[PDB]
A paper describes a structure:
S-Adenosyl-l-homocysteine hydrolase (SAHH) reversibly cleaves S-adenosyl-l-homocysteine, the product of S-adenosyl-l-methionine-dependent methylation reactions. The conversion of S-adenosyl-l-homocysteine into adenosine and l-homocysteine plays an important role in the regulation of the methyl cycle. SAHH depends on the cofactor nicotinamide adenine dinucleotide in its oxidised form (NAD+), which is self-regenerated during the catalytic cycle. The protein structure of SAHHs features three domains in a monomer, the active form is usually a homotetramer.
Structures of archaeal SAHHs were determined from three organisms: Methanococcus maripaludis (MmaSAHH), Pyrococcus furiosus (PfuSAHH), and Sulfolobus acidocaldarius (SacSAHH). Comparable results were obtained for the SAHHs from Crenarchaeota (SacSAHH and SsoSAHH), which were only active with SAH or adenosine as substrates. The motif HxTxE found in SacSAHH (Crenarchaeota) shows the same interactions with the substrate adenosine as in bacterial and eukaryotic enzymes. We observed that the exo-amino group of adenosine bound in SacSAHH forms additional hydrogen bonds with the carbonyl oxygen atoms in the main chains of Glu342 and His344 indicating that the adenine ring is in its preferred tautomeric amino form. Similarly, our complexes of PfuSAHH and MmaSAHH with inosine and the complex of SacSAHH with adenosine show a closed conformation state of the molecular gate in their active site. However, the rotamer conformation of His in the His-IN state of SacSAHH deviates from the rest of the His-IN conformations among the archaeal SAHHs in this study. The side chain of the gatekeeper residue of SacSAHH (circled red) shows another rotamer conformation than in PfuSAHH and MmaSAHH. For SacSAHH, the conversion with the unfavoured substrates was slightly higher compared to the reactions performed at 37 °C; nevertheless, the enzyme still showed a substantial preference for SAH synthesis and cleavage. Similarly, MmaSAHH tetramers and SacSAHH tetramers exhibited an average ΔGint value of −133.5 kcal mol−1 and −127.5 kcal mol−1, respectively.
Residue numbers in the entry:
A (entry chain E), B (entry chain G), C (entry chain C), D (entry chain A): 4 to 415
Write the structure that this text describes.
């Protein structure tokens, strides 16, 4: 079930472009097409349907797996890529422009094949599978994003998890590169595609200085902006301060910011009261998963006029007469107003993704009520695969250097 | 003569978007709509048909002028903006996808109105009127880009220039922001729209360290890239070196680079021989005017296979089998793969444009053989308008301070 | 025992300057002078004898402790600060220019008072006390730097450690600001004081991309240098690559670098054979603790001439005829060629020291052979104290926000 | 006449250090010692007596010139370098700690040899020579700094100037590197030597966004500070805003800034009323020539108690009780609290110096009443000499490329 099966030829060129820029995932595909480690394994995945998800899902099929795919976000599907995937053997039930009903119809669709492994992005598939008492034949799962692992850890503290799950988000090759480097470029890209706004002179307010937010602040600063950071963590506010960024409350930032981007995993982090004090022409965007970081509800009630300027650009006139610009319906603007993270960075996360599924199948003595970090050996193999593909040589410790480091005394 | 007038409503929404972010040009429109300084003046323009050129030409029409507009590059025209301009009173002969005959047909159309003022971007319109012996009724003109000013300075050395022309490119409020800050964002934006390539880990080669090239290198570096500069000027190469960038010849850079962007006003700075030595997957883009900085004709002859991967992304197979990616067919990647400079920066550039046409009509005792710089009084009013629009106060010198600096003797 | 007790007035002005720039440590001092949590406690300390160490030990004296202090490095001691510290009640055995025999004689001196708590900087005091069986009355200790933590953990896996030790280096408020921010500024400052070298156009090689090396690379880049990273960890090599730095082996960097700075906890990281490959004029510096990161013993044997150019700058002429400049005899150049970390950054590290030393006395039911990280409560109190002192307001999470974070169930 | 002739050995090691780091000036010295272009010429110079002036002054002696040297600033002289110069053949009258009477006594000393050439830094020697009716035997002169060029240009408008003067400050290889890159590092180095202040977390105010101030802002930003710019020109305030810096008046910046550095050529730019509004602990420093940018005379009259904390750091207690720290007594902090610009950058400025003196001797048909910019041929030789010494290759323009640049017509 896709939007237009006629775009598969244009979409196929997009997956090959992504393949040529995912050398590490292509190297794993070769061991997969040779040892077929996922033979007879049925995978249910709710992921962002991109050209990069296509390289991972088709790499898993090369390992002998049967995959059912559903979009992780109702506006994230690249329609051409979904067409190209259907023309192959991928049971893809997703298209851009879904409604909330279509979203869960597509999730029930991927679930009729009765999967052994559950691959999820924001936590919805793990929640639905548990809330409707499936889980029976499920051997394990993986979680791709920060918000999904928090839901999964809450599930695990409640003794509700029924299969072991790998938090691929917690791998060094993921959150240090996907969340930071990838979202830094992608979020700015989405802002520029939805609006051709000048970054140079503007006061940009980044709410959240976690891995996503510090990458956004870095690239706003690299684009010439005056960066303001709002944080609730004492540690991360001091990090942003010592990195040269003005740190303050949203109450103060509400009056100065020209662009506000949210990168929390939290609710109404930009609230209706905040928006009332904002300047005329202020642009709002969200980079966390789920459209609840900005009070989009409040903005619609305090508003007396809405209109679309263009794709992903919505204008709201408040009673005070001032105009507020919402980007991408408050959904993660990188994947909705643009294409998400580059193919080169998703190479790393989808290498942990692919290898963590092989690890889940190869094992079955794991705890069905436990959230796992990626095994450091898999984490390290991904890094060596990327360096190998990039032609970067690293120093090898000498024997005298390995000896000196085990030592605590001296050497007369 | 445009592509589809059915887009006039969407394009109008784009021009209104530009209007709100070009506040300094809007305040000039107010004094223009009241004093009608260009009443009875007919203007012929070769500019990039964008939402920002739309705000400039309609600002000119408010001053009482009749305007004929033709596209400056055959792929830069925004079709909806061209439609919206047709719904108003602008005689626009341009559309995306033109041919060289269509380009010069649209220029001959512009010349039927017997223009009083000639507004040009790349110098193509000024050259035509002189080479085809029109210019009879022309009172003056303006030049927007570095390439056009060089030609007009060459035209003036041969005493073929027939009217005074203002080098709007040379105004401080233009080349310091349009050429540097504007192209820096725009070119990265165009690169990211034609390819979703990660800039962070890459070796980016910028050929040309003028105002355009240093803005591009700054933004490559701000996006995380390893920047290499190729320069032919000893001064600007030493500047690029002291700005922390690796400086070398194209022969050395060609074997190392992942992305090559050209920003000269010159010919074959990325040559046939350079591409033969480049890595597999190297991306080529041009930011200067005219498609001759990269030898695109040579690339077609050393190629055995060509293919379009996506809009504005052409793939070439070489005899060695290595693939070379060309962006926007070697045309300005900012204006062809994206939307050009933000409206906020073109506000500064088009304030000189509008004020320089008013300056040409108020005067008539200028040299019909001279390229002029923008009058410094106008140059300083543009910056004061932006600051007044942005809410930035500057310090005013006290009288003891103004006197101290006219003094040179012993004692203060 | 200090060099000249007559400088006690000059040192006092230096210690008072630090007090004004360690505001968070002063509020701990006020709560110490009132609650005297360290009554009847004798402390033996091996630390860098600086104005900031003076503010910490006197904060310890105010809490009712008796302190014996010995220098952590034979060239780090500020003699006036030691004089000023002796004029009060601090048993300080240290001066600049010490011999290695003086170093270990001074350690027996502070160890004569039979301390209950051991404060060590590079691990030397923890080792001596253990190899010579003086742990009998020692109730606990603290460790300040990464190299000391590695030694203590080796003692811990080797099960010889005899008291609990708090790894103060591993606190977020320590390694994120002290190791990263402080050493970045301090090392560049030391390089500039021993040489007024131009950083801008130069190739600077940072060996080690941990917290110290990334801070050094950040400040080299900010001072205009072209930064090259050498690393042995695949994770950290990819971290350096994605941050825009060329990553290679020492074998390649040795022939291209102008400045070499070491930031490993390791031995012979810049070897005898690397220096023979270096260019005429290359500068060598070390920022990790202990002067064994640069093969300075090897450099002296392959050299034919050595001479002092100025304070902390020794020039060596090689058999090749080329000149190699060594800074501060390969000892930590930040603390030897300059004054170490600013007072504002050591405020954070020495707040952890005081609060974690008080924590060692508050308890006594802790495990022998156990290295602990700083309790997360104290780590956060240090962070909140700095924010309060800097006047920085942090955002407060609402009740609806704390609820949405525990949920994993469907419905928004 | 110097302070201590016994320091001549330490100074010579410092001049040798500069010679090894001024390769381009070392290349001119050999052409000078061979072609003796300045034989029989007497030169009187008022410059900062540094290891870098020593390399230039001895380079002039190598060309056959007789040189008398006096310090340009009473606290800038490097005493060991002055001793080393006196042991050679340099009539040097300078020492650190001069009084204003000593300053002009020393200028009369160097003026007793009746020089044909005047080398000046801040304009004082040009002013004295004109105000006391000498100039009789003077054949020409040079000006090194911006402040001197303004005074000399007023002398030209007043028709008082009696010999031709070369504005060495206005050459690209000077103001693009000395004023910007050199002073940027130099000023931060001086601040760090007078105080070990953390730059990272601080608000730094740069008053003046010319070539000096923008270099200082670049280095504050590179050291992690939050940079605020105060400007009086609309053009440069817009330059500072688009470079990402908060721009405001001194009245607003005075209440926010932690460090204030002045880089104007102007008077009372930091006023007494401004200082009373400042935070407690604010640091003041000056980078423009002459100690009048900060109202230091006003600050001494508003204070109730003053004391020196360390070299170049005085603490002032204000009537409101707040503490204000002044650096280098309001004088160039780069040259008084540190060692001025690195030798690699002064290589460029003193190469223009050396080459422009010979150009003054080669000629005598220049208007003996006019200020000239450095001849473009010499500016270009300086750039190529530096590029060759650094091993940097620049691209050579093709014969086809040289033609395409003079063409203007349609096609070819
Ligand atoms: N492509 C993408 O856009 C992308 C990529 C990866 C992760 N993510 C999503 O981004 C979000 C964060 O990712 P992260 O890895 O940065 O997690 P993270 O939790 O490290 O960053 C979260 C930060 O938000 C701060 N925060 C929480 N409530 C706040 C409030 N009310 N005001 C201000 N700051 C507040 C926390 O202190 C924390 O530092 C998650 O929702 C994750 O799923 C998005
Ligand atoms: N929106 C845009 O895309 C935009 C904006 C402004 C200008 N431009 C175009 O950009 C080009 C230049 O802009 P500029 O303002 O940088 O002009 P500029 O001439 O200052 O910069 C040109 C630089 O190219 C260097 N150069 C020339 N030939 C070279 C070669 N063979 N190898 C290396 N370097 C070489 C020159 O030394 C000079 O420094 C012009 O064609 C102008 O029309 C485009
Ligand atoms: N004021 C200071 O100078 C200061 C402050 C804190 C720590 N330190 C010292 O700095 C050193 C490191 O501190 P860190 O916090 O950076 O610890 P860290 O372990 O994060 O950094 C160590 C890095 O060194 C790299 N490394 C080890 N051997 C290498 C080799 N042979 N070639 C290349 N890279 C190699 C490792 O990969 C590791 O990433 C330690 O000696 C620590 O005590 C100094
Ligand atoms: N080694 C050094 O420290 C060094 C080197 C070169 C020049 N200088 C001195 O530095 C000073 C500046 O040199 P420049 O080359 O920067 O010249 P410049 O004139 O480009 O910079 C001066 C800036 O100060 C601004 N200004 C004047 N009054 C102001 C005010 N009241 N408030 C705010 N801004 C104001 C002017 O608009 C101008 O942009 C000169 O006095 C020069 O002699 C010092
Ligand atoms: N191009 C992409 N394809 C697939 N997933 C992506 C892409 N870009 C970002 N993501 C993922 O989207 C998640 C946010 O929901 C992040 O965890 C991130 O890994
Ligand atoms: N969005 C835009 N609209 C109109 N002209 C533009 C735009 N972006 C760049 N330009 C102009 O294009 C010229 C290059 O031909 C530059 O001089 C620049 O001013
Ligand atoms: N100014 C300083 N005063 C005291 N200790 C310092 C200073 N600068 C750095 N250090 C410490 O020196 C140690 C290196 O041995 C680091 O752990 C660091 O915390
Ligand atoms: N180290 C130095 N030696 C000599 N002159 C210097 C030095 N640093 C800066 N200057 C000069 O001082 C002038 C400012 O008075 C500037 O023109 C600059 O060239």
């Amino acid at each position: 079930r896709v939007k237009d099966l006629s775009l598969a030829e244009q979409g196929r060129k997009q997956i090959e472009w992504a393949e040529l820029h995912m050398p590490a995932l292509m190297e794993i595909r070769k061991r997969f097409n040779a040892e077929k480690p996922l033979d007879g394994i049925r995978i249910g995945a709710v992921l962002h349907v991109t050209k990069e998800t296509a390289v991972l899902v088709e790499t898993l099929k090369a390992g002998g797996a049967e995959i059912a795919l559903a979009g992780s976000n109702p506006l994230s599907t690249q329609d051409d890529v979904a067409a190209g995937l259907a023309k192959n053997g991928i049971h893809v039930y997703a298209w851009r422009g879904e409604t909330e009903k279509d979203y869960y119809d597509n999730i029930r669709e991927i679930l009729k094949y009765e999967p052994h492994v559950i691959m999820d992005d924001g936590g919805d598939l793990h929640a639905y599978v548990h809330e409707n008492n499936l889980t029976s034949k499920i051997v394990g799962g993986t979680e791709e994003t920060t918000t999904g692992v928090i839901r999964l850890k809450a599930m695990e503290e409640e003794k509700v998890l029924k299969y072991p799950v790998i938090a691929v988000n917690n791998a060094f090759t993921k959150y240090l590169f996907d969340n930071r480097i990838g979202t830094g470029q992608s979020t700015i890209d989405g802002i520029l595609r939805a609006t051709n706004i000048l970054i140079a002179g503007k006061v940009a307010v980044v709410i959240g200085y976690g891995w996503v937010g510090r990458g956004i602040a870095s690239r706003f600063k690299g684009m010439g902006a005056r960066v303001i950071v709002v944080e609730s963590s004492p540690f991360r506010a001091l990090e942003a301060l010592m990195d040269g960024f003005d740190v303050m409350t949203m109450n103060r930032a509400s009056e100065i910011g020209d662009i506000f981007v949210t990168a929390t995993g939290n609710l109404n982090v930009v609230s209706r009261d905040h928006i009332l004090r904002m300047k005329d022409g202020a642009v709002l965007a969200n980079s966390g998963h789920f459209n609840v970081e900005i009070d989009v509800k409040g903005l619609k009630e305090i508003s007396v006029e809405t209109r679309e300027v263009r794709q992903n650009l919505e204008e709201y006139k408040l009673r005070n007469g001032k105009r507020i610009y919402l980007l991408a319906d408050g959904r993660l603007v990188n994947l909705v107003a643009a294409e998400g993270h580059p193919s080169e960075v998703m190479d790393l996360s989808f290498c942990n993704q692919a290898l963590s599924v092989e690890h889940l199948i190869k094992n079955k003595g794991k705890l069905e009520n436990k959230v796992y970090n990626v095994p450091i050996e898999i984490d390290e193999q991904v890094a060596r695969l990327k360096l190998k593909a990039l032609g970067i040589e690293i120093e090898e410790l000498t024997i005298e250097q390995k000896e000196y480091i085990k030592q605590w005394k001296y050497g007369t």
